[model samples]
Target: KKYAKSKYDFVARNSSELSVMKDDVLEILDDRRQWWKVRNASGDSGFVPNNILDIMRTP
Candidate 1:
């Protein structure tokens, strides 16, 4: 798994989810779908839409 950061704030729809703040670092658990499963820096885990995140690039 990889990691990413939130570019904006997001609210979770369920209990087994995480709400994110702008620039929050998230552990990327799955990246195969439009919605990715991730864990926030505060230790909360959930699915977030990929469009709202900023993924790191490797050179």
Candidate 2:
């Protein structure tokens, strides 16, 4: 499961879309431009804005 960098109130451009709340952890399925495919705890998967996502850091 991937972690959300910030909070997001998902507003879908279409009917089949996923909504994510702030600091909600998500599982990333696809990484693309502008939007990224992710799944939430409820098993909802959809595209989220790329800008708000925080890059995974490695130590």
Candidate 3:
């Protein structure tokens, strides 16, 4: 969660600091009934639910 303290904080300040979503190979680190941990090809890691992951292929 995030919070804004002043009205000036509500305005966008670093609009150019955003990065675009790039395609990468994600490796599964762990799989539970409800969630999964994955690491991208670039070594970035995160967790997501099974409901959101697209199961296009199996290994």
Among these predictions, the greatest TM-score belongs to 1
For model 1, the run of ten residues with the poorest summed lDDT? 50-59
TM-score of candidate 2 to 2 decimals: 0.68
> What ranking emerges by TM-score with the best candidate at the front?
1, 2, 3
Tens digit per residue, CA lDDT, model 1, 1-59: 57888899998888865689899888898889999989888776788898999887655
Between candidates 1 and 2, name the one with more favorable TM-score: 1
Candidate 3: tens digits of C-alpha lDDT, residues 21-54: 3233345666664644555444555554444445
Clashing pairs in 1: none
TM-score, one value per model: 0.82, 0.68, 0.42
- Misplaced by over 4 Å in model 3 are 1-24, 56-59
| Pairs of residues at least 3 apart in sequence or in different chains that clash in candidate 2 | 7-22
lDDT per residue as tens, model 2, 1-59: 44555455666678566676677777778776678888777887888886767756545
The TM-score, computed over Cα atoms with residue i paired to residue i, of candidate 1 is 0.82
